[model samples]
Target: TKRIRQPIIAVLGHVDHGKTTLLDRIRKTNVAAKEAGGITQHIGATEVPIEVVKKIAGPLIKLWKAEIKLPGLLFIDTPGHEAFTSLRARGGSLADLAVLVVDINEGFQPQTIESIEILRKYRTPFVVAANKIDRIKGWVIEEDEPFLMNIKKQDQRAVQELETKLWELIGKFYEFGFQANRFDRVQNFTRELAIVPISAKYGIGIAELLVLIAGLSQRYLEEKLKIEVEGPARGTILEVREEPGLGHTIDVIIYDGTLHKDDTIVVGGKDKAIVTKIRALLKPKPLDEIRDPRFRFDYVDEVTAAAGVKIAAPGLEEALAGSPVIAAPTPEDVEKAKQEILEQIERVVISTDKVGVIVKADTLGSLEALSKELQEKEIPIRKADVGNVSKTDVMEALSVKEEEPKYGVILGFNVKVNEDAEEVAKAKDVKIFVGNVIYKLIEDYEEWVKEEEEKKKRELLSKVTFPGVIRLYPDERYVFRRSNPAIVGIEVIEGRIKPGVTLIKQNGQKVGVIRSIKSRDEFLQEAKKGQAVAIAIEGAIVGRHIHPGETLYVDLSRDDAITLLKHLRDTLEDTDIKALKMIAKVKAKEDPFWRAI
Candidate 1:
C-alpha cells in the first residue's frame, strides 16, 4: 500500500511583499523580526502537522466536505526573488504547490514577473496571497472576527475598494496569459487561478489561505503525494552550513524513502560525485519551542520522506547547495548512486566552445538556469560551474582574452567573486558581471557586448579617410619651403580634416595629401568644421595644384564611401553623412554606378 507524505509548499514573492510575515503568522512565531532585514536570508522549511491545520482552520475545513488524509504540510519559505529556482527535480521544480504573495498596495514588480514565469515553466500550481489589506484606505479590524466575516462588517465603500484592487490584479494576470479571479469566484481548480486577499500583519485571512492550500493539495495532488517509505532515500540539499560544534552540516529536504544514521549518501560535487556517511540526524523542535536555543532540536535515529532534516557528516564541505543527494544503505547501492549523480550533473554543466564565456553560480540549479538562458541567446560558454568566481576562473577567462577579447568575461549568478579573484580580474582587464537576478545578469552581458562591437566599429572607421568640403585661403598661403611640402590656411566647410588624409577636386581630380596641421602655432592632429588651420600639403605646388577660395572635397573612393555608410552609419554625424552623400555624387561622375555599389 502507498503511504502519503507531507506536501512541500514553496512561498515565493518579491522582496518586502510580506512572504516572511505571512509564514510567521501561519506558524504563530516571530521569525520575521529575527531575520536580518526582515527578510528570509536562506531557504527554511516549517513542518505544520494536521493538528495545527485543524486548529487554524477551525470551522473552515468543515465547509469543504473533504477529509484531510495527509499527515501534515511541509512549508518551504525561500529568500525573496531566489525562491522558485532554488529547488529543482528531475522533470521540474521540487515544489508540489506554491504560494505567490503580492503586495496589494504595489502591483507587479520585476521579481514578481520572474516568479510567475518560473511557475509557468514548471507547471506548478499556485495561489496568490493579496497581502497588506490593512494598509488600504478605510479598513477596520474587528477583534476575534473571522477574515470573511470582518469583510462583511466593513462599509460598502471599503468593500468596493477591495474588489477594485483585486480586479486590477486579475487584469494584470490576464496580460501574462493567466485566467485569475478571487478565490471564491474560481470555478475550476485546474483552469482558473485563485487570488486570496489578506493582511499578514494582523493575521487576517491566514486561516482561509491555509484551508485553500490544504484543500487544493488534497483534491488535485493526491497521486503525487504517495511514496514507498521502504525504498532508498532521495533528497535535494537546501543549504550547507558550518555549525558551531557540528563542523560541517547539510540542511536537506528528503522527498522519498528513509534516511538512517551511518547510511552512505552520494552528492553532486564541482567536478565529481561525493560519497559520505550520515553521522547524525537532527530535526527542529516544535514551532512553539523554537524560540529557545537549548530546545531547538531533537536528535533522531532516522528521518523519513517529506521532512526537512539536518545531517552531520564528513566530506560535506564540498557538497554544494541545490545538488542532488541520494542515500545508499549498502555497498552494492553505492555504485548505482554514483552513476545517477553523474548523469544529473551532466545535464547542467555544458561546454561546447574551445574559447567562450565563463559562468559561475551559487548552486547547481542556478548554474543550470544560467547556462540554459545563455545557450538560448546563442552565446557560447567555455566553462560553467557551481561556486564563487574563484581565482582560477578569472585566470581561465584571461587566457581567452588573447584570442577574443570580447568573450573574456565571467558571468556570475547569485554568487560573488572572491576578493583575490576580483583583484586579479582588475589587473588582467577581465570583466566580471555578478548579480542575484538571472535575467539582469544576462542583460548586462548583452549590453556590454553591444558597446564593445560599436567601439570596434569606430576604431575601424578611424583608419578610413572622412568625407569633407574645405576652402583654401590663397592669400594666407605661405610656402615655408617650395615643392617638397606646400603650407597654406584652409577652412573646413563641412565634415572633418585630419593629417595623412588626401584631398581632391569636385570633378574627381587629386589635390594633395594633408601632411600636418597647426592651430595657433600649437600642432593639432585634426581639424573640424568652422576652424581655420595651417596645413602642409605633399606632392603639390602652392599656386599650381591648389588656390584660394577653391572648394575641395576629401578624397573618398567609391568603395570607401559605400563601406562607411553600410557599417558605421549609426556612429556618423549629420554633417559627415551629408559630406559622404556629396562625395558619392563626385565619385558617380567617374563611375556612374558608384551609388548602386
Candidate 2:
C-alpha cells in the first residue's frame, strides 16, 4: 500500500533576492549570512517534521481552522539556478512544490525571469514569496499583530505605495503567462498564482507563508506524494564528496522505497553503470545543525522514502551526481538494476554529431540541461560527458578547430578544466567557457561566437581593393629611381591606400600600380586618409603617366567593387561610399553592367 511522503520544495530566485534568507527564516537559522559571498554554494535538503511546522505556524493554522494530515516537508535549498537545473527527475523536475522568492523592494531581475521560464518548462506549481516588505519606506513592524492587520494600521501614503509596488509585480507576472494576486485574494489555487508578501529579515508574515505552503501541498500534491515503501529503493544523487576518513560518499535524496546497509545498488555512470553495496546509512543532525558540516550524523541500518541520506559504499568514486540510484537486495535483482541504470545513462549522455563542440558538466542532469539549451540555440555537440573538463576534451575541441573554428570550443557547466587541459587549450588557441550557471555560459558563448564572426568578415574585406582619393604633387616632388618604378609624394584626401592597388584618373584612364608605401621614412603596408605618403608606382613614368594636384581613384574590378558594396558596406565611411560609386561608374565604361557582377 502507498503512503503519503513529504513534499520536496525547492527555493529558487535571483542572487541577493533573499531566497536563502527566506529559507533561513523558515528554519530559524543564519544559513544565508554564513554562506560564501552571501550565496548558497551547494544544494542542501532539510527535513522539517510536522511538529515543528505546527509550532511555527500555530496561530495561522488555527485561524484557518484546517486539519493537517501530511507528515512534514522536505525542503531543498538550491543555490540559485545552478542547483535548480541540477535537480532533475526522469520526466520533469524533482521538486513537488517551489517557492519563488522575489525581493519586493526590487522587482524582477535576470535570474527571476530565468526561474519563471524553468518553472513553466517543468510545469511545477509554485507560490511567490514577495520578500523584503519591511524595507518599504515608512513601514513599521508590529510583532503582536498579524501581517495584514499591521498593514491596515500603516499610514495612508505607505499603504498606497505598498499597493502600487505589489500591483507592479502582478503585471510583470501576467507577462510571464501567469495570473497572480495577493494570497488572500486568490480564488482558485489551481488556476491563479499565490503571492505572499513578507519580510524575511524580521520574520513577519512567515506564518502565513508556511500555512499557504502546507495547504497547497495537501490540496494539489497529495496523490503525487504517495510512495510505496515496499518497492525497490530509488533516488537521485544530489552530491558526491570525499569524506575525511570514510573516502568517497554520496548524499542521496530517496524519493521511494527503502535503502538498507548491505543492499546492492546500481548508479548511473558516464560510460557505464556502477554497481556497489551500501556499507552504511547516515542521517544529518536535526534542525539547523544539518547546515553545519562539522555536525555529527546518526548512523542507521535503514532509511525510508522522502529522506536525505549519506551512503557509504565501495565503488562510489565512479558514480556521478544527478545520476539515478537503485537498491537491489539480491544478485538477480542487481543484474536487472544495472541494466536499468545503463539505459538511463545512454539517454542522458548525448553525442550525436560526428563534429561539433565538446561539453562537460558535473552531473547527468546538468549535462542534459546544457545539451538541451545548446541544441535549442542550434549549437551542435559532438562530445558530451560528465566530470571535469580534461585534457582529452581540450584535444578533441582542438581537432574540430581544423574543420570548423566556431565549433572548436568547450562549454563546461559547474565543472572546472584541469591544469593540463588549461595549458593545452592555451597552446592550441582553443577557448573553454566554464560557469556554474547554465544560462550565463550560453550567453557568454553566443557573444564570443558573434565577435569571432565579425572579425572573420573584416579579414576577408582586407584581401580586396578599397576605394581612395589622393592629391598628387608637382614634378619637383617626384622621386624616381628607375624607369620601371616611380616614386612620388601624395596626400590622401579620402578613404585609404594600400600596396598592389591600381590607380585611375578622374577621366577613367589607368595611371599606375602602387608597389609600396612609406610615410616619413617609415614603411607602411597601408596608408589611411589625411596622411602624406611617398608611393613607389610600377609600370609608369612620373610626368607622363600622372600629373600634380590631379584627383585619382582606386581602380577596382567588377568582383572587388561588388564584394565591398555587399559585405563590407558598414565599414565604409561617407567618402569611401562616394568613392565606391565613382569607381563603379568608371569601371562601367568597359562593361555597362559591370557593377552587377
Candidate 3:
C-alpha cells in the first residue's frame, strides 16, 4: 500500500516578486528562461515528485529530511497579487501554508506590504522568502553554492545588508503588532514570524523552505490546513473565464472535502445566488501530450480537498472573487449553502460608528484591515465599500452630516471620486483625501483630525481674518494696487491673483477693489503698491464697483489659486450655456444662506 504524500503550498506575494520564479525553480520547468515574458500568467497547480526534491536537497537532505514526513510538494500558483484574492474567497483561505516571496534587494514593496496584510487578515500562517540574495554585492557562496552555505561561511557584508533590510521589515510588522524574524533564529512560533532567505534562480534554500512549511503544518495550523477526505466539498473560485463556445466557466480549487463530476453546486454573489449544474472536470495536459489535438484536457471524476479542478457551468453571472462554493447532492441543499455564504459575506462584522464617514478600499481583506485599524483609533466609519468610490459614497458621507456639515469626510485608497462628487465636495466643503498609497492617506487623516482637535482648543473669535477685495490693474493683468476710498484705480501688488481666494472684507463687509478683474491693457512689467489703473467689473461698471470706507486686501499663499482659476477657465470655455442662461441657477442651495446675507 502506498502512503499519502505531497505537502500542498500556496505561493503569494506582490506582482513580479519571484512567486513564479520560485515555482519554476522548484519544478525545474526551465520555462522561466524560455518564455518571452517572465511570469506564467493565471493560476496553476502541479505536483512535484519526491525524486525532484531529493535532487534539489542533495546532501542537505541528511540534515533536513528527518523532520519531513511528506514525500513531495504540491504548489498552487496564482497570477500577480490577485491570487490571494481568489484564495480568500468565502470565509476560509484555500492554501495550507503560504510562501510569501519578497525581493530581498528591494525589501518590502507596496504589494509585499499588501500580501502580508492579506495573510494576516486570513489568519494563514506564512514563511517569508528573502529572494534575490544573489543580487546583493559581496554575497559569497561557499563551495560555489551560495544557495546552501553555512552561516559561518556566509559573506558578512551580504548578511549585514540582509539583516538591515530584515530589521526594516520587522519595524513594519511591529507597527501592526506582529513580530517577524529570520527563520534560522526563530524560537517562539506564536510570538515571532519566520523569514527564510531563498534564491529562486539558483535553487538555494528551497529544501529549508519546504521543511519549515512541513514543520509548521505539523504544528500550529494542523487543523486549518489539514486535509479532510470525508466531508462536504467546498472551494473558492480562482479564476472566471468566457471561452469561445464555452459560455461561462470557472477554475476552482477545492480546499476542503471532495467533489465529483455531475455534482450540483452553487456560487455566491450579491445580485443573486448562482445555482449551476456541473458538467465536467478539466485538467491541463502536458505540452507533449497534445499531439492528438482531439483531447485537450484529461478529465477526472472526483477530486479531494486541496485539489485544483476546472468546472463547466451554465448560470454564473457574477461569481466574484472570494466567493465560497459548495458541492451538494440536491439543488435545494446547494441553494441553502449559497444563502449561508451570502449571509456570511453580508454580515461581516464591520465595527463602525453611525455618525462619521468612511474611506474604503477595493478588496474584502483591505476593507476589513482598514475598518479594524480605524476602529482601534476610535475613528467612526459610517459606511465602506469594496470598489471605486462612487457618487453614492459621496452621498452617504454627505448624508451623515446633513445637519452638522462638519462630520463629513471621504478617504479613498487606490480609488477616485467621480466628477459630480468633485463638484459636491467643492461646493459643500466636504473633506476628501484620495491617494494610491493607503498609509499616506491614513497619516494625512490622523493629522487632519489632530488639527481639528487643536482648532477646538483655540478661541473661535481669534480665528477670523478680515476679508477684503483688490482691483486688477489696467495694462497689468496680474497686479493688485491700493487706491483712495472710491473710484480709485489699482494694479497688481505682490503676486498674481487668479480666482477663488475669498474676497477679503473688513468688519464683515465687502471692501475696495473692482467687483471682478479682467485685462485688455498691456503695459509695465510690475505695478507698485499705489498705481492709478483702469478696472473691469462683472456685475457693475468699474466706477460704480468701488465703495467708501473699504480696504483693498490680497490673500497670500504658496499655492496660488491656479486650480480654482483653471476650473473657472474650463467652465468659461464651454460658454454655450453660461452665456445664454444664468450659471447661478445650477448652484445647489446650501445652509446658512442668511449668514452671508
Clashing pairs in 1: 474-548
Ranking by TM-score: 2, 1, 3
Clashes of each: 1, 0, 12
Per residue, candidate 1 scores C-alpha lDDT tens digits across 210-247 of: 77888888887888678888887888888889988888
RMSD (CA, Å), candidate 3 to true, equals 11.3
Candidate 3 TM-score, true structure as reference:
0.66
Candidate 2 colliding pairs: none
402-468 in candidate 3: lDDT tens per residue? 8444457887765677876788777766778887555567778878877876676453323322112
- Alpha-carbon local distance difference test for all models: 0.78, 0.77, 0.59
Ranking by lDDT: 1, 2, 3
True-structure lDDT of candidate 1: 0.78
The positional error of residue 50 in candidate 1, measured at the CA in angstroms, is 2.9
Give candidate 2's whole-model lDDT.
0.77
By TM-score, how accurate is candidate 1? 0.82
Considering summed lDDT, which 10 consecutive residues are worst modelled in model 2?
Answer: 33-42
lDDT of 2 by residue, 6-64 (tens): 78788888889898887777666223222332211122676555665666655667644
